Design a protein around this ligand. Structure first.
Ligand SMILES: O=C(O)CCCCN(CCc1cc(F)ccc1OCc1ccc(-c2ccc(C(F)(F)F)cc2)cc1)Cc1ccc(C(=O)O)cc1
Length: 182
């Protein structure tokens, strides 16, 4: 993934657990060569997976729990590190944001060819609910998407409940989430 994702993980862990713990996690993951992450440089996905695995071992939390935390963090982090206006342009409510996300990533993709944006499709079931189909070229990030949705509920001051109903990791076509929101 683009370096920005790995910088954001470094930032979350550092802010939350201190530099010592981050350095440890960095070393466990086998990444002490890499001095800083370059935000607009494409990295092998494995660098990301290895950071999450290693942070899981070091902090004593499951990877999927860290992904949820990380998903929430991403929404705030990117707003503060140069994508505040981009996120604003995506809408002023949770459903509109999820509707615009494929288009938001298109705009990211223009400058940055190695972007592999996931696809998000909304089937709105009422004015307070939707089925969300999440289609990704990556495995194992559904819990991050859970975190992301909560990051957005916070951003828009909307209470939101997310329940996954189809699981890509068990060989289903794609993750599907049932969402209820204020
Ligand atoms: O499944 C998957 O593959 C990954 C799913 C999890 C990650 N994705 C979250 C999408 C999301 C979901 C959401 F609900 C809310 C917010 C969200 O973010 C808004 C946002 C999205 C992206 C940038 C940005 C900014 C800059 C750059 C660059 F580095 F300069 F290139 C790159 C991306 C900013 C804001 C972002 C993503 C997607 C693909 C890649 C890549 O392929 O590398 C990297 C990151």
């Amino acid at each position: 993934m683009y370096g920005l994702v790995n910088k954001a993980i470094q930032d979350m862990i550092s802010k939350h657990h201190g530099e010592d713990t981050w350095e440890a996690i960095k070393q466990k993951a086998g990444l002490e060569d890499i001095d800083f992450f370059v935000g607009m440089e494409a990295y092998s996905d494995d660098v990301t997976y290895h950071l999450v695995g290693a942070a899981s071992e070091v902090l004593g939390k499951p990877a999927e729990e860290l992904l949820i935390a990380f998903g929430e963090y991403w929404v705030t982090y990117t707003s503060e590190e140069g994508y505040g206006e981009l996120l604003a342009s995506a809408g002023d409510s949770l459903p509109e944001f999820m509707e615009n996300l494929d288009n938001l990533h298109a705009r990211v993709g223009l400058s940055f060819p190695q972007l592999r944006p996931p696809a998000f499709e909304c089937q709105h079931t009422s004015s307070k609910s939707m089925e969300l189909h999440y289609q990704s070229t990556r495995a194992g990030l559904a819990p991050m998407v859970l975190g992301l949705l909560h990051g957005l509920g916070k951003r828009f001051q909307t209470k939101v409940e997310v329940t996954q109903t189809a699981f890509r990791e068990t060989g289903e076509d794609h993750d599907i989430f049932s969402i209820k929101y204020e």
